[PDB]
Design a protein around this nucleic acid. Sequence first.
DNA 1: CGTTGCGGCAAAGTTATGGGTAAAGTCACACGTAGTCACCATAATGAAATAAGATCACTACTGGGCAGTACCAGACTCGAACTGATG
Length: 51
Amino acid sequence: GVLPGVLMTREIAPLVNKIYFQNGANRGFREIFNRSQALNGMGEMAADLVQ
DNA sequence: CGTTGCGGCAAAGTTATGGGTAAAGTCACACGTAGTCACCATAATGAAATAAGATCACTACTGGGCAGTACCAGACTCGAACTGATG
């Protein structure tokens, strides 16, 4: 019952150790939204999201 | 024994009481008795009103994200050219 942006900002991003994750979790996590394609990619960000 | 007063005995006399029978009184039939306020509690609405409830409008306070900007490479693709085998 929460918005996916809210879930990413308040539940996922603090759990991610990356600096930009924590920083953008408090001014609008537009970095993870403008590049939502890479969340499904082969790379490190996709694997981090799965973890 | 003769007389006189006294007392028992049993009709006789006097009141009283509950019955019957003719005969003097008594009284309703005469259009008429029912009829009428006064009385205070209970149901029973209908109106008066509720006390709270419902919504509008305004004022102030405080979370807080989106369109846009920016870099640092890694990696695939391919002009343009080099160079070797060959019929």
